[PDB]
Structure formats: structure tokens, C-alpha cells
């Protein structure tokens, strides 16, 4: 059948190279709606 | 899908048919759904020059009917596979 096995669990996740990610804080609802109005309705 | 409105046999308002036996066969079907082709038939065809009007030699002809099931009726060419439009054409079966 398939060439998979239980010994190969997590292979791709363990093998992918770790790239550090920037810190980020999401917006509050009012600021998000402000941003969407600014970027979509406006220019 | 239902081929033909006849059910394949013009049986009439009845429940069961007396049914017959096929010639060269025996698969056959009832009185309807069978072929009953008629031929003139006479022994020794075109000897009427050398017989009949020589000696006294009075011959006889006998009209003869042959009954065939669907398989033999197709087999001896008495029935073809006509198209859908021509399936409802009323033709005699070459006597």
C-alpha cells in the first residue's frame, strides 16, 4: 500500500527550517473598522 | 426503458394465450409474438415444360405456412432491425 509509517510522524514539521516571526498585536474592533474604511472606501 | 407500446406482442385484452411451437426451434412464444410466413410451395418447380403438358402429369400446389420464433425470424432474414422511426411502418413480410 502506501509508503507511510508510524515512525515518520511529524517528519515535515520537524524538518522545516525555523524562521523567527515578528511580534504582532491585533487591533481592537473600532480601529479595525477604521483601517478597513480607510483602505477600502478611501484610497 | 419500455421499447414498443405493443409489449412485443399484439395479444389483446386477455390474460393468457394458447401458444405454439417454433419450426426449427421450440424456444417460441404464444400465438402472437410469432412469425407465420406463408409460401406458395409446389413439388418440382419449372418442370412444367417437361411434365404437366406432357404425359398427363397433373401436379398440385399447396400454400404452406411456417411458424418461427424471434430468433429464427431474424436468422432467416424474415425480420430486420429497423430504425426507431421505421419501427411503426406497416409492411407485409414478403408474403
Amino acid at each position: 500500500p502506501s509508503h507511510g509509517s508510524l515512525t515518520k510522524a511529524g517528519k515535515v514539521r520537524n524538518q522545516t527550517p525555523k524562521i523567527p516571526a515578528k511580534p504582532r498585536k491585533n487591533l481592537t474592533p473600532r480601529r479595525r473598522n477604521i483601517r478597513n474604511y480607510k483602505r477600502r472606501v478611501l484610497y | 426503458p419500455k421499447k414498443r407500446k405493443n409489449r412485443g406482442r399484439k395479444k389483446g385484452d386477455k390474460g393468457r394465450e394458447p401458444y405454439v411451437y417454433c419450426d426449427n426451434c421450440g424456444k417460441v412464444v404464444p400465438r402472437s409474438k410469432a412469425i407465420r410466413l406463408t409460401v406458395p410451395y409446389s413439388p418440382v418447380p419449372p418442370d412444367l415444360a417437361r411434365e404437366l403438358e406432357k404425359q398427363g402429369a397433373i401436379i398440385s400446389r399447396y400454400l404452406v405456412t411456417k411458424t418461427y420464433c424471434i430468433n429464427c425470424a431474424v436468422f432467416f432474414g424474415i425480420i430486420k432491425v429497423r430504425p426507431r422511426e421505421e419501427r411503426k411502418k406497416r409492411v407485409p413480410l414478403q408474403q
Binding site: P1, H3, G4, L6, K8, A9, G10, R13, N14 | -
Partner: protein, 144 residues
């Protein structure tokens, strides 16, 4: 082939009985009325249950797909029944160990049956030793 059937003005009870007779042709109504879920379900109608992991197993995906989906065998505490529970997430099986208490939960899929290409698996692991496997996989928590 004509005129429903009991249409009379004083045919109300007969119409009600006739309509109630044909509700038993519905699989859902019959199952709900006869309690087949609470008789034959390993979860016994609960949205989740507890179990102890016995062995790690790998099921083969259905024909067009090629993969070994990794599950475990879990024995439920409340009934003792042993059922195969899919362990989701990449590398999720490595957070599972034998004799580990796990939270068994319905895999989803149509009508509570098996999921897309996994044949005959109805459950999946949500918690491992009291900690959610999602949090463990994401690193927000560590398995105790």
C-alpha cells in the same frame, strides 16, 4: 393515483394516525424514538469521553489517497470499550504515549460517522493527560 386519501372534515384522527404510521420510514425519527444512539454508541450520547491509550496504530487512507493516518487504540473508562481514535495534527502522535489518559471526541464527518479518507474512524483525541493536544502542538502548553 387520486385524492390523497382521508380528506374528510371528520377524518382528522384518521389522517393523524395515517401520518404517524409513515414517520417510522424515517431513519432519523426511528433512531431518536428508539434510542439507538444511547444503546450502541461508545460515547453513549456524550459529546466527549475519557480513555486509556493501549497501542499506537496506523490506518491506511482510502484508495485514491496514499497515507498512513496515525491513530491510537483507546479503552473508555465508563464502558471499557476499545475504539480507534485518530490523532490529528502533524507530529501529533509523538505527544501520545501508552497508558496515557486521553479525551476522546467525535471526529466530525457526515452524521457522526468516519471522516473523508480515513476508513472506519469515528473519534479523535482532544486532550492528553488533561492538556489539550492543540495547545501542546502549538506550544502554548506542555504535556504533563
Amino acid at each position: 393515483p387520486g385524492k390523497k386519501s382521508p380528506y374528510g372534515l371528520f377524518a382528522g384522527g384518521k389522517l393523524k394516525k395515517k401520518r404517524q404510521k409513515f414517520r417510522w420510514n424515517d431513519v432519523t425519527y426511528k433512531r431518536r424514538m428508539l434510542g439507538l444512539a444511547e444503546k450502541y454508541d461508545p460515547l453513549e450520547g456524550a459529546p466527549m469521553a475519557r480513555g486509556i491509550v493501549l497501542e499506537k496504530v496506523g490506518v491506511e487512507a482510502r484508495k485514491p489517497n496514499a497515507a498512513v493516518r496515525k491513530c491510537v487504540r483507546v479503552q473508555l473508562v465508563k464502558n471499557g470499550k476499545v475504539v480507534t481514535a485518530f490523532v490529528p495534527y502533524d507530529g501529533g502522535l509523538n505527544y501520545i504515549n501508552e497508558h496515557d489518559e486521553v479525551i476522546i471526541e467525535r471526529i466530525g464527518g457526515p452524521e457522526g460517522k468516519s471522516l473523508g479518507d480515513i476508513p472506519g474512524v469515528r473519534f479523535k483525541v482532544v486532550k492528553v493527560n488533561g492538556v489539550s493536544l492543540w495547545a501542546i502542538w502549538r506550544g502554548k502548553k506542555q504535556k504533563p
